[PDB]
Design a protein around this ligand. Structure first.
Ligand SMILES: CC(=O)c1ccc(F)c(-c2ccc(C[C@@H](C(=O)N[C@@H](C)C(=O)O)N3Cc4cc(Br)ccc4C3=O)cc2)c1
Ligand SMILES: CC(=O)c1ccc(F)c(-c2ccc(C[C@@H](C(=O)N[C@@H](C)C(=O)O)N3Cc4cc(Br)ccc4C3=O)cc2)c1
Lengths: 162, 162
């Protein structure tokens, strides 16, 4: 658990969208070049507390109601670094592929006798990083450009789509 | 990193394991006490990458059991990824002897407000696997309650999404 302080920029907005998942509050959307982006907030981070109050059981509307109705331009948050994050290493075959089909940044299929198949890569998982580069927010064709310019080793970080 | 385990059948060609297809992968759903599977370290939620050399990718629950049933000699080789969905949460009992969560069939279904569980971001729709190193998979709810009731102030629980 870590504590991040956020300064509200002009319209009392943090550039953050939160979602209620399994009675927890998670980071769902982080706008680029925003107060939230600045202090390290990433897709899949868990918010434990907002201004010292527990987020447990809060609905998605409650979390946003709290963030806007907060007095003063400073909001403290206690965060847990993407708890659902897993890393999987794969190798390109002779055709330059590791073996998976994706749509909207989410793995939808695994090709038989592929590197993804040998390494137990899962479907219904969003891709977060490829070889260190963040891919949340990129269009599918830009993600394919990163995969295409990769060496033989393809390490991807994934999380269940939820 | 995955590890290889060698399993020797006990008498009836039984390995003492129950499998489950999840997200085009195969995971262990139950490990029998004192069995060949229990002997080599297999635990609930372990991922099976290969059975006797072939990829489990896309295999159904029935397919995995069919392949295990139809194994030739008394030796079944398996490539395992150690419980990939495992998270550990440490909580402290309050003055009334509780950490603050409700469960049914071994699954967290509610988080009590202002509790140690709420402070630690404990999540619902998660199966409880262990409590202070004691495996609780396969136990009745009143037996899980008995383990919590006789625990010290520190309560560390291992969980996995349902
Ligand atoms: C045995 C093995 O490995 C193998 C053997 C033969 C094959 F024809 C393949 C294979 C070839 C191409 C692809 C395409 C696949 C892809 O390039 N995936 C990467 C991650 C990869 O497999 O390396 N993309 C590209 C793409 C772009 C955009 Br815009 C949107 C979606 C996608 C997508 O799913 C998929 C499979 C695979
Ligand atoms: C502030 C705080 O903590 C707190 C405040 C007020 C509270 F009324 C509680 C609290 C009291 C009791 C329980 C019961 C709850 C329980 O004992 N859970 C443990 C894990 C715990 O909370 O320590 N079980 C026991 C049980 C047995 C069987 Br059989 C089936 C289901 C369950 C179940 O969910 C739950 C909450 C707690």
């Amino acid at each position: 658990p870590r504590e991040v302080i956020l300064c509200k920029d002009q319209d009392g907005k943090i550039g953050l969208r939160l979602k209620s998942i399994d009675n927890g509050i998670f980071v769902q959307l982080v706008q680029a070049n925003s107060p939230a982006s600045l202090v390290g907030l990433r897709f899949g981070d868990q918010v434990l507390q907002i201004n010292g109050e527990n987020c447990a059981g809060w609905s998605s509307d409650k979390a946003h109601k709290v963030l806007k109705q907060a007095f003063g331009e400073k909001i403290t948050m206690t965060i847990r670094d993407r708890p659902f994050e897993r890393t999987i290493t794969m190798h390109k075959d002779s055709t330059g592929h590791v073996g998976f089909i994706f749509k909207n940044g989410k793995i939808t299929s695994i090709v038989k006798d592929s590197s993804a198949a040998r390494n137990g890569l899962l479907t219904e998982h969003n891709i977060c990083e490829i070889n260190g580069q963040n891919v949340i927010g990129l269009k599918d064709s830009q993600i394919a450009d990163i995969l295409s310019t990769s060496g033989t080793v393809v390490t991807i970080t994934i999380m269940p789509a939820f």
